[PDB]
Design a protein around this nucleic acid. Structure first.
Ligand SMILES: Nc1ncnc2c1ncn2[C@@H]1O[C@H](COP(=O)(O)OP(=O)(O)O)[C@@H](O)[C@H]1O
Ligand SMILES: [Zn+2]
Lengths: 155, 211, 503
RNA sequence: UAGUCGGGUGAUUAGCCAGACUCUAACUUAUUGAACGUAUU
């Protein structure tokens, strides 16, 4: 991990320098470059810059995956490395995963959840508390605080 | 083309200095309101309704960087390079397509009169005005070639079918000169002329109606 | 593990459900089953579910179509991207712009689906290392990436076909595993319980070859269901196979007397109705067995004629429609209307050999006969475009060198528009030829009347006489010429009554 | 209109209700390793 992070220090530096001037923010989760901007029609020129910079730096060894270059906007689904970005500009787990968690909690309410799926739900609710804290409060309202306390951590 | 009248220079233009500050820095949303009053949402070179539009510099910044932040060299032209390059007409064609032109050989709609330098035939083709000789004819031909007024089929065909769309109207109005008295026919001509102001091609239709 | 697959499958994931089914099946008397009755039933219901909409057409719940195509260093394209529509996509442009290249790439991609439907681990067609790599590319390899949609449970099926140039040390592999997985799902589910299979067809320029009934020992069995995939992406649909299949159907129908009703008669009737409805001139088709070689006869404009006496244009279109109808009928046995099955059909130059009268209705007839088929079509005609929505058109700029990233739709609505307008705007072609000197005569006239003062003189009268002699009296050109004459004689009597009072 | 976002109800991954968005334009992915959250500690 650290070797791969260092091998793209110059790539990250050049991309960030050339990308912040056009008002585009750039990140990389070590294999997955993310660009976003509030200015329309400026991201369409980024993949060519990425390709030419990769050729300049790594030659032919490192290259983009042209089948994995995805454009998106508020008209479509928006998720960055597993977290859905709402139309309200807030982080979320997505409607489908939040309904899945609701189904799991409802199953636990009636004692239809075995040990393995109970552990999976406690793990997923820890992750949900990390990503979307308001979901925990909403589930406390929906499924009562006592039931959530019995499932989640008690000490 | 159509005559363009100016107003006060926008207050954000003088806040920037040519040379030190590049053009891609400026905020266009503010230079545009002033380029919309002057043009009425129509191109300054072909009189097409501006659905895809960009700020055009009459003197290119590459050759003449000095006139980069000067309300007089600014213009509103159709097409958009930011929305992909599918435009062989007007400003984009002047900067990219035609090439090998002199800026003093192109009529400026800002100051020079386009009516006496260009004639719009009802067949949809613009030709230099009758009786033009010397530098005026050369300027008209250079403008027509560089701005591609005759050229890409999209503009020529749209302008032609715009002019021939009102040919029955022109025939019907002008065939009733003897039926109507001078004042009523005169006011009908004004009524017809002032409602083509909102129409797309300002001067092609105007040439077809008037005198 | 098992539980992750169960969580995904109960959420609607087709791949996870199939993985669970295959695993649980493996244990024959162990955990799982034969129709796993949870996992196999969910897979088959995913493939087979659908409802009849308000118009009477069956619509699958999870449609199958091609979403996106990326071409990297393929023929003339450095990097091209297309966003094909679900129902109809029409690619237009000049000659040598790459429409046939796009259809060829899509067909090469679909050949893997066909091959893995036919056989387990079957190998489809591959890109050529002699002509498909861009000649002036630096990398010396080409890619053809595709993404397929098969409902919400399988939203992306990425497949990439790659080939390195001849004499290159480093070779490039093809990522064809997801297509193999989807076709494995189709084939395995079909084996246990018959399901409707997709139809993949390519109709290139390679069609329209002469047709003689020279196919007797043709080796293969045309009744066999999986014969509908034989040479289905070669470019020329097997019309001889259709003739043999039709004669087989006729023999089985005339030699016969779950409901004691022959399904061969139903198939024959469906194909007959499709052929008669799509092809304009053909009204009825049958098989004659007296004069005891088998012959197929059609009614062309009220005259009973044989299948080899059709013209080039009524025989090519008939071959296309008949082949498509046969394959759809054979691949969709459980559908009430087999032509409502899903699939992808590529047609190159749909207006081939067709009169302008036939071009006004070919698209509508094809889409009415096959409503769930994704048609990807190229054309050289404004008449075909006038019957097609603007959003379905992907145009090539007239000054493209292959370095365009994304193909787009025109800015002008083409449906219901006049042919001259579509020619001028969409196709970038003058309505009146520019190379003919007689085409500039009306404009050259105007000038003469304006070079003077709206008034006829010697040379303007000479030009008007020339226009009279060439175009004629009833021609529109003379109508506009005399309209201009009358008008300019009128705006000058006006000018007269004005300058006189203006001094 | 689609498509997307997701606040609520719903023995609950489904169905429904309310609200909202629309650069030509998401497709939800990977461990035991790395880091993050959580629990023992
Ligand atoms: N390997 C290649 N390198 C470069 N150009 C190619 C290559 N293969 C084909 N072309 C070009 O691509 C075009 C192919 O035409 P085609 O795809 O059939 O277009 P259309 O459907 O418009 O007739 C031609 O203009 C040809 O010169
Ligand atoms: Zn213009």
């Amino acid at each position: 991990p650290v070797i791969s992070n260092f091998c793209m220090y110059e790539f990250d530096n050049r991309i960030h320098a050339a990308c912040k001037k056009v008002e585009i923010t750039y990140t990389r989760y070590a294999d997955d470059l993310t660009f976003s901007s509030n200015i329309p029609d400026v991201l369409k020129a980024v993949p060519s810059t990425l390709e030419v910079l990769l050729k300049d730096l790594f030659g032919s060894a490192l290259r983009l995956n042209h089948s994995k270059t995805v454009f998106s906007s508020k008209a479509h689904n928006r998720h960055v490395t597993g977290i859905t970005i709402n139309n309200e500009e807030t982080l979320s787990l997505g409607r489908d995963r939040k309904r899945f968690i609701k189904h799991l909690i409802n199953q636990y309410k009636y004692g239809l959840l075995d040990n393995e799926d109970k552990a999976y739900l406690i793990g997923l609710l820890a992750f949900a508390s990390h990503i979307e804290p308001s979901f925990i409060t909403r589930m406390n309202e929906k499924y009562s605080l006592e039931l959530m306390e019995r499932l989640r951590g008690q000490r | 083309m159509r005559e363009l009248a100016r107003l006060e220079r926008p207050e954000i233009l003088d806040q920037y200095i040519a040379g030190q500050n590049d053009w891609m820095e400026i905020d266009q949303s503010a230079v545009w309101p002033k380029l919309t009053e002057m043009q009425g949402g129509f191109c300054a070179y072909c009189e097409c309704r501006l659905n895809r539009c960009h700020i055009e510099h009459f003197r290119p910044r590459g050759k003449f960087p000095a006139l980069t932040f000067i309300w007089n060299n600014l213009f509103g032209s159709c097409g958009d390079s930011r929305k992909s390059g599918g435009w062989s007409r007007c400003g984009i064609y002047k900067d990219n397509g035609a090439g090998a032109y002199n800026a003093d050989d192109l009529i400026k709609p800002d100051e020079e009169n386009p009516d006496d330098y260009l004639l719009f035939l009802t067949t949809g083709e613009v030709v230099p005005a009758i009786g033009l000789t010397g530098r005026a004819l050369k300027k008209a031909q250079e403008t027509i070639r560089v701005f591609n007024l005759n050229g890409d089929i999209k503009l020529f065909g749209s302008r032609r079918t715009a002019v021939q769309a009102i040919m029955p109207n022109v025939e019907y109005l002008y065939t009733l000169l003897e039926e109507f008295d001078e004042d009523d026919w005169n006011e009908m001509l004004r009524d017809e002329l002032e409602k083509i102001e909102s129409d797309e091609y300002k001067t092609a239709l105007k040439h077809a109606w008037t005198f | 593990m098992t539980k992750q697959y169960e969580r995904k499958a109960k959420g609607g994931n087709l791949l996870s459900a199939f993985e669970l089914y295959q695993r649980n099946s493996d244990k024959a008397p162990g955990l799982g089953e034969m129709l796993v009755g949870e996992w196999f039933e969910m897979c088959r219901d995913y493939i087979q579910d659908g409802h009849v909409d308000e118009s009477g057409i069956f619509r699958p719940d999870n449609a199958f179509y091609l979403r996106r195509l990326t071409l990297k260093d393929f023929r003339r394209f450095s990097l091209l991207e297309i966003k094909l529509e679900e129902d109809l996509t029409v690619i237009i442009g000049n000659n040598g712009k790459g429409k046939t290249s796009i259809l060829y790439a899509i067909a090469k991609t679909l050949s893997w689906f066909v091959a893995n439907i036919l056989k387990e681990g079957g190998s489809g067609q591959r890109l050529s290392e002699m002509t498909d790599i861009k000649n002036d590319a630096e990398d010396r390899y080409s890619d053809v990436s595709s993404t397929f949609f098969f409902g919400k449970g399988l939203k992306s099926v990425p497949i990439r076909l790659s080939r390195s140039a001849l004499g290159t040390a480093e070779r490039r592999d093809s990522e064809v595993k997801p297509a193999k997985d989807l076709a494995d799902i189709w084939r395995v589910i079909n084996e246990v319980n018959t399901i409707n299979l997709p139809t993949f067809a390519l109709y290139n320029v390679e069609r329209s070859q002469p047709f003689n009934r020279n196919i007797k020992d043709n080796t293969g069995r045309r009744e066999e269901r999986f014969d509908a995939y034989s040479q289905t992406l070669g470019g020329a649909g097997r019309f001889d196979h259709f003739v043999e299949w039709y004669i087989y159907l006729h023999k089985r129908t005339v030699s016969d007397i779950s409901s004691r009703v022959l399904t061969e008669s139903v198939q024959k009737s469906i194909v007959e109705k499709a052929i008669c409805s799509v092809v304009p001139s053909i009204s009825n088709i049958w098989v004659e067995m007296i004069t005891g070689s088998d012959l197929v006869k059609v009614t062309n404009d009220g005259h009973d004629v044989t299948i080899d006496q059709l013209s080039d244009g009524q025989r090519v279109f008939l071959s296309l429609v008949a082949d498509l109808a046969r394959r759809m009928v054979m691949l969709n046995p459980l559908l009430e209307n087999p032509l409502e099955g899903r699939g992808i059909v590529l047609i190159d130059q749909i207006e081939l050999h067709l009169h302008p009268k036939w071009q006004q209705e070919v698209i509508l007839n094809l889409r009415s006969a096959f409503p769930n088929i994704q048609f990807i079509i190229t054309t050289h005609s404004p008449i075909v475009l006038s019957t097609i929505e603007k959003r379905c058109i992907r145009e090539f700029e007239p000054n493209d060198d292959g370095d365009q990233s994304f193909l787009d739709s025109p800015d002008m609505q083409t449906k219901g528009s006049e042919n001259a307008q579509i020619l001028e705007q969409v196709m970038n072609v003058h309505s009146t030829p520019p190379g003919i000197a007689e085409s500039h005569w009306l404009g050259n006239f105007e000038l003469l009347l304006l070079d003077n003062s709206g008034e006829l003189d010697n040379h303007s009268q000479v030009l008007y006489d020339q226009i009279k002699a060439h175009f004629g009296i009833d021609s529109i050109e003379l109508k506009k010429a005399d309209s201009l004459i009358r008008i300019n004689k009128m705006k000058n009597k006006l000018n007269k009554i004005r300058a006189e009072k203006g001094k």
